[PDB]
């Protein structure tokens, strides 16, 4: 997908809580590869579903982000997780 648009969606909607791929709200639910894989979330469609619907203290973005923005940011997250979030 568009990784330039994902990074920008992410800086605008996700980084308050996940800067650097971590998680200041629930410290074990990070965006690193091994963590996503432990929970069955290392997939484009798992991330899209959770971005759209929310989960516990993760807000829902259905209706605040377009389908394209959500697709982009899911792709960005997966790209970064692959690279270790350097
Ligand atoms: C804080 C207010 C957050 C914002 C803004 C976003 N997310 Fe988040 N995320 C948050 C929590 C509390 C959790 C855990 C929820 C639970 O109880 O299970 C998460 C989880 C995720 C995950 C899965 C992480 C994992 O299983 O290891 C992903 C993939 C994720 N969040 C991505 C994400 C994106 C792309 C966001 C912007 C659109 C975003 N989050 C916002 C907290 C918060």
């Amino acid at each position: 997908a568009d990784l330039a648009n994902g990074a920008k969606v992410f800086s605008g909607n996700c980084a308050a809580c996940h800067m650097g791929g971590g998680n200041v709200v629930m410290a074990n639910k990070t965006l690193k590869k091994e963590a996503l894989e432990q929970f069955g979330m290392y997939s484009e469609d798992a991330i899209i579903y959770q971005v759209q619907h929310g989960k516990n203290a993760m807000p829902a973005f259905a209706g605040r982000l377009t389908d394209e923005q959500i697709q982009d940011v899911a792709a960005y997250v997966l790209d970064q997780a692959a690279k270790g979030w350097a």
Side-chain angles (χ1 to χ4, degrees):
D2 193 355
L3 295 178
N5 197 46
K8 173 199 111 88
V9 175
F10 185 99
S11 289
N13 305 277
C14 314
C17 309
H18 295 295
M19 185 92 235
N23 192 332
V24 311
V25 170
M26 253 181 66
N28 60 313
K29 294 283 199 209
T30 64
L31 319 194
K32 303 176 70 127
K33 177 170 199 262
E34 258 198 43
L36 297 170
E37 287 197 301
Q38 296 199 141
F39 299 121
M41 296 281 303
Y42 193 73
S43 93
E44 186 105 9
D45 219 284
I47 294 168
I48 287 175
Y49 190 90
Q50 180 141 334
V51 163
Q52 311 222 71
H53 279 106
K55 174 146 194 213
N56 287 322
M58 175 160 158
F61 295 83
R64 306 207 273 132
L65 305 178
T66 69
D67 295 314
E68 173 185 13
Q69 294 177 300
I70 291 177
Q71 269 161 71
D72 284 318
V73 69
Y76 170 74
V77 165
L78 273 171
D79 172 64
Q80 287 296 107
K83 288 152 143 85
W85 287 94

